[PDB]
Amino acid sequence: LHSEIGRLNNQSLLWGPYRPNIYFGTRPRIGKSLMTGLMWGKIESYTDFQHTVRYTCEQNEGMKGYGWDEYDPRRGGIQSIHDIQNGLDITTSFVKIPGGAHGGSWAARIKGTLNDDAPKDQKTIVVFYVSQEGENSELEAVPSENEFGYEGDVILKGRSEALGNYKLVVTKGKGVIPQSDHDLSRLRGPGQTVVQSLTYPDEVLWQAKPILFQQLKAGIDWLVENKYDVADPPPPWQVYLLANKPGSGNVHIVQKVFEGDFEFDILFSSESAGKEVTSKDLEREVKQATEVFGERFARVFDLKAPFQGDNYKKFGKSMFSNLIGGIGYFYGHSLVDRSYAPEYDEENEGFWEDAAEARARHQEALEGPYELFTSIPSRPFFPRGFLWDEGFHLLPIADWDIDLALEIIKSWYNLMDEDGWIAREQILGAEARSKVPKEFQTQYPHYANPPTLFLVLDNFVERLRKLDETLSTASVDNPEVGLEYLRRLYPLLRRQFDWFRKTQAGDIKSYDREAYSTKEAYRWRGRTVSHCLTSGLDDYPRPQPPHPGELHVDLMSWVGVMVKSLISIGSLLGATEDVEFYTKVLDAIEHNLDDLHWSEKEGCYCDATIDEFEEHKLVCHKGYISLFPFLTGLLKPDSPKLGKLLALIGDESELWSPYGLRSLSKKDEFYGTAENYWRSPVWININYLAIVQLYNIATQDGPYKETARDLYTRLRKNIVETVYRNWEETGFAWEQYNPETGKGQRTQHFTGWTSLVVKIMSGHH
Ligand SMILES: O=[N+]([O-])c1cc(-n2ccnn2)ccc1NCCCCCCN[C@H]1C[C@](O)(CO)[C@@H](O)[C@H](O)[C@H]1O
Ligand SMILES: *[C@@H]1O[C@H](CO)[C@@H](O)[C@H](O)[C@H]1NC(C)=O
């Protein structure tokens, strides 16, 4: 039955708008296949189009906003784009129609509305770009009757092994088509939909913009050569209308020009399914998808007081739809340094200088190809997989569709190498690389990241203990299916755990360090004087100078998180020898957190170093790091230490701002210094962990129950209201929030773990 659910899930998830790096485009979960993309831009002059045309996601003053209003990867959804520069509001509706043997069919509606400020006779160029990678695949544009282009629909017929036979149709559409009285029309027509069918080497097919512009440039070259000059120039829009030349090839450009409002459809018909998809099919299924989305949202994300209002519901729908709408399929090679240079061991004082020398050897090479199915922090700024981010992304998604989330977790673990390493940033293929400076592409096998995907697994296990709709919860509804999933994944989880202890081990034995265990101590590799990027808390102040005898309390707490998970999963699988080993490790971490990390003088947890005199020293900077054992759920609900942490969390003069918990204390000497990234701002992922642990203490009998209940109530309200207030004013979720002004700052479109706010509102953890 597991194999059967596997196949059904594959078929359900195959097609999507799985290119979150562009405003709108589709690809299936197949490395080398058919991809589609949308471009538009106003044309007012002979030179402006190259500046106006939209393709890849950005966020600047020329773009008011964009995002998914509704989305489910099984059914599709509706996206809204508000383009100031091009004076357009665009809607892209996408819908999936199951059937046949090849992952089903789909359709899209592209609707453009001129905004109030736009000239009522604006000319807009719109391009639908289609490409196909494959050795034995074919794609052919059926030619038009008319001399110069299409009066009606453009039909592409194609075949691949993965897709079988299919037809893709770009409809004539509704909206005024501008007409030219110029002489050029004798040779190019007066104005009509055109198609160029081209071939290029497979690996450059993703470069849609440069490919389009090269065609446009050859068009203009033709004009000059054929004596169309500045004495009497054709209109700008006609200068930029490609000459019709349809045919076979691995690239097809479908170009339309519109004056005023426009709309057109894209219909993809899997031949192996029933009758071909129609426009009428599209509208019906769109209506149906919205109805289904609304129902699931009210079940899954029941927003509790004081966020029951329609304003908060809209806010929740938007935050959630953008998070789930960010899911992408990525494929290609990665840049990895596989030297394992000895300087990367970081065993000596000054190690950061030795490590940089080794990096400057530039031994990294491309490897793979790999594929990844994942959500992403930010369409415009971070459109790729981040390891510890995904743990947070999947918490809301798992509520929506555990089978989806499990699929994504599986995607991630399928990347793990023989050592147990998964690269913390997944840049797959030349397309993904185009968005990343080369210096920052290289992944290092010694660099870890928080193993937050364990948290999602914890949620899955608890649920397991306690037709799309059916598929979405198949893995919990059929307990044998869930366990089979865990059976396969469990060895990879154990491998990663072992990798942590081999590669991120700290040094107890070689110093004057008394502690309950000689094994349990941990140190993030990859730290510079000012940074520890691998920890995820980029610039949070750590011991100075960096030192091989450092110990990091957050890393140890994550190791705690992992063992707990392996205890739960091992028990389920009856790995008795395993559970006994983990149990001892959990015991050891609990004592060693106290022995090496607890500061009585300061009343919180702390990183450690080794002195100028070779003595163990705590270095305390009060902030998220100080709370880590609490945030990770390692503290007993009656613990005196917990009490002290609750005092720190609730202290206004330290961590507690009107807008949420500051990442660093106002009293810390590093507050608001340097890049001030993790040195004061409020971060929703860490606030989310606090809220969940506060709630936990609040809903059990114990001495801190009422303290936690008060803090839970207020922190939930503070965090939700902060994100909502900014969403209301700016239309954006932000990477972080200013604790003095409440203002969102840094990266826009951070959906992104900011979207956890949907889970915070719906409560009842
Ligand atoms: O380095 N580049 O890619 C880069 C590319 C371009 N650029 C623009 C156009 N083309 N290229 C410009 C600049 C940079 N430098 C920035 C590198 C520092 C890494 C950011 C800090 N990480 C944040 C966010 C997460 O990393 C992901 O949400 C969290 O995981 C983490 O916890 C969190 O602190
Ligand atoms: C799901 O995607 C395709 C469709 O069959 C296949 O190549 C892939 O391996 C499937 N997953 C597994 C592990 O079978």
Tell how far the Cα of 6 is from the centroid of ligand 2, in angstroms. 9
CA distances from 631 to 434, 452, 560, 634 (A): 37, 12, 11, 8
Tokens of 674: 């340097």
CA distances from 365 to 127, 323, 340, 525 (A): 36, 32, 13, 21
What span, in angstroms and rounded, lies between the C-alpha atoms of 7 and 370?
21
Ligand 1 environment, Cβ below 6 A:
377, 382, 386, 388-389, 435-437, 440, 536, 538
Angle between helices 479-503 and 402-413 (to 10 degrees): 40
Give backbone dihedrals phi and psi of 319, rounded to 5 degrees, phi first. Answer: -60, -45
Which DSSP category does 338 fall into? -
3-state secondary structure 301-331: CCCCCCCCCHHHHHHHHHHHHHHHHCCEEEE
Ligand nearest to the CA of 426: 1
Q: Please list, residue by residue across 430-450, b when 16 or more beta carbons sit within 10 angstroms of its beta carbon and e when fewer do.
A: ebbbeeeeeeebbbbbbbbbb
Three-state secondary-structure class, residue 481:
helix
Nearest-atom index, ligand 1, CA of 378: 28
How big is the CA angle at 674 (ends 691 and 353), to the nearest 5 degrees?
105
Tokens of 241: 């209308």
Q: Which of 498, 410, 423 is nearest to 453 (CA)?
A: 410
Tell how far the Cα of 745 is from the centroid of ligand 1, in angstroms. 14
Tell how far the Cα of 332 is from the centroid of ligand 1, in angstroms. 21
Ligand nearest to the CA of 533: 1
- What does 573-614 look like in DSSP terms, one character per residue? HT-HHHHHHHHHHHHHHHHHIIIIIEETTTTEE-EEEE-TTS
What span, in angstroms and rounded, lies between the C-alpha atoms of 321 and 492?
31
CA distances from 688 to 318, 650, 661 (A): 19, 15, 10
Nearest CA, atom 10, ligand 1:
435
CA distances from 17 to 93, 247, 325, 732, 756 (A): 10, 26, 8, 21, 23
How big is the CA angle at 642 (ends 639 and 643), to the nearest 5 degrees?
95
- What does 399-435 look like in DSSP terms, one character per residue? HH-HHHHHHHHHHHHTT--TTS---SEE--HHHHHTT
Instruction: Report the run of H or E that residue 640 belongs to, with start and end.
Output: helix 640-649
366 Cβ neighbours under 8 A, 6+ residues apart: 333, 334, 335
Tokens of 609: 């170093």
- What does 132-147 look like in DSSP terms, one character per residue? E--SS-EEEEPPPSSS
Ligand nearest to the CA of 383: 1
Tokens of 26: 């589709």
Nearest CA, atom 1, ligand 1:
440
Pocket test for ligand 1, best of 378, 387, 389 (most atoms within 8 A of CB): 389
For the chain, the distance separating the N- and C-terminal CA atoms, rounded to the nearest angstrom, is 31
Q: Please report the resolution in angstroms.
A: 2.3
| CA-CA-CA-CA torsion sign (599, 605, 608, 612) | negative
Give backbone dihedrals phi and psi of 461, rounded to 5 degrees, phi first. Answer: -65, -45
What span, in angstroms and rounded, lies between the C-alpha atoms of 716 and 694?
10
Q: Cβ distance 567 to 499 under 8 Å? A: no
Numbers of helices and strands, H then E, in the chain? 22, 26
Tokens of 341: 């240079």
What span, in angstroms and rounded, lies between the C-alpha atoms of 551 and 663?
20
CA 130 to chain centre: 24
Tokens of 172: 């004539």
Q: How many CA atoms lie within 13 A of 107 on its CB side?
A: 22
Name the H helices within 447-574.
453-465, 468-472, 474-477, 479-503, 553-573
Ligand nearest to the CA of 438: 1
Going through 211-348 in order, the beta strands assigned E by DSSP cover 251-270, 328-336
What span, in angstroms and rounded, lies between the C-alpha atoms of 648 and 574?
41
Tell how far the Cα of 10 is from the centroid of ligand 2, in angstroms. 7
How big is the CA angle at 36 (ends 34 and 37), to the nearest 5 degrees?
155
Burial of 636 (0-12, 13-18, 19+ CB in 10 A): exposed
Tell how far the Cα of 208 is from the centroid of ligand 2, in angstroms. 28
Give residue 706's identity as a one-letter amino acid code: E
What span, in angstroms and rounded, lies between the C-alpha atoms of 412 and 497?
15
Nearest-atom index, ligand 1, CA of 449: 30
Nearest-atom index, ligand 1, CA of 538: 34
Pocket test for ligand 1, best of 382, 422, 558, 747 (most atoms within 8 A of CB): 382
- In the chain, breaks (C-N over 2.5 A) are found after 466
What span, in angstroms and rounded, lies between the C-alpha atoms of 324 and 28?
16
Give backbone dihedrals phi and psi of 36, rounded to 5 degrees, phi first. Answer: -130, 155
Q: Cβ distance 254 to 204 under 8 Å? A: no
Q: Cβ distance 43 to 240 under 8 Å? A: yes
CA distances from 348 to 101, 414, 526, 534 (A): 59, 34, 13, 19
Residue position matching structure tokens 């490897």: 367
Tell how far the Cα of 349 is from the centroid of ligand 2, in angstroms. 48
- Per CATH, the number for 18-278 is 2.70.98.110
Tell how far the Cα of 102 is from the centroid of ligand 2, in angstroms. 12
What span, in angstroms and rounded, lies between the C-alpha atoms of 387 and 378?
14
| CA-CA-CA-CA torsion sign (277, 281, 287, 293) | negative
Q: How many CA atoms lie within 13 A of 375 on its CB side?
A: 33
Ligand nearest to the CA of 663: 1
What span, in angstroms and rounded, lies between the C-alpha atoms of 646 and 643?
5
- What does 246-262 look like in DSSP terms, one character per residue? --BSSEEEEEEEEEEEE
Nearest-atom index, ligand 1, CA of 440: 1
How big is the CA angle at 752 (ends 540 and 671), to the nearest 5 degrees?
20
What span, in angstroms and rounded, lies between the C-alpha atoms of 156 and 163?
14
Nearest CA, atom 31, ligand 1:
536
Tokens of 233: 């120039």
What span, in angstroms and rounded, lies between the C-alpha atoms of 415 and 274?
37
Task: Report the catalytic residues.
Answer: 538, 735
Give backbone dihedrals phi and psi of 138, rounded to 5 degrees, phi first. Answer: -135, 150
Nearest-atom index, ligand 1, CA of 437: 11
Q: Give the number of other Cβ atoms within 10 Å of residue 653's Cβ.
A: 8
Nearest-atom index, ligand 1, CA of 424: 30
450 Cβ neighbours under 8 A, 6+ residues apart: 387, 388, 391, 535, 536, 554, 558
- What does 683-694 look like in DSSP terms, one character per residue? -HHHHHHHHHHH
- Please give the biggest Cα pair distance in the chain: 91
Nearest CA, atom 4, ligand 1:
436
Nearest CA, atom 15, ligand 1:
440
Give backbone dihedrals phi and psi of 10, rounded to 5 degrees, phi first. Answer: -55, -50
CA distances from 244 to 187, 219, 229 (A): 11, 11, 21
Nearest CA, atom 29, ligand 1:
536
Which DSSP category does 377 fall into? S
What span, in angstroms and rounded, lies between the C-alpha atoms of 126 and 88?
12
Tokens of 11: 């078929």
What span, in angstroms and rounded, lies between the C-alpha atoms of 20 and 376?
8
Domain boundaries, the chain: 18-278, 328-374+378-503
Give backbone dihedrals phi and psi of 569, rounded to 5 degrees, phi first. Answer: -80, -40
Tell how far the Cα of 9 is from the centroid of ligand 2, in angstroms. 10
501 Cβ neighbours under 8 A, 6+ residues apart: 519, 559
Q: Cβ distance 396 to 758 under 8 Å? A: yes
Q: Which of 34, 17, 12 is nearest to 103 (CA)?
A: 12
CA 656 to chain centre: 29
- Tallying the residues shown for the chain, one arrives at 765
CA 604 to chain centre: 33
Burial of 150 (0-12, 13-18, 19+ CB in 10 A): buried
What span, in angstroms and rounded, lies between the C-alpha atoms of 120 and 465?
61
Compute the radius of gyration of the chain from its Cα atoms. 28
Q: Give the number of other Cβ atoms within 10 Å of residue 178's Cβ.
A: 17
| CA-CA-CA-CA torsion sign (430, 432, 433, 434) | positive
What span, in angstroms and rounded, lies between the C-alpha atoms of 338 and 1?
40
What span, in angstroms and rounded, lies between the C-alpha atoms of 53 and 48?
9
Q: Strand pairing of 76-83 and 63-72? A: antiparallel
Q: Cβ distance 439 to 359 under 8 Å? A: no
Q: Please list, residue by residue across 547-564, b when 16 or more beta carbons sit within 10 angstroms of its beta carbon and e when fewer do.
A: bbbbbbbbbbbbbbbbbb
Looking at the DSSP assignment, which residues form a beta bridge with residue 198?
Answer: 251
Q: Strand pairing of 25-28 and 15-16? A: antiparallel
Q: Cβ distance 398 to 405 under 8 Å? A: yes
What span, in angstroms and rounded, lies between the C-alpha atoms of 457 and 409?
9
Nearest CA, atom 11, ligand 1:
436
How big is the CA angle at 46 (ends 43 and 50), to the nearest 5 degrees?
60
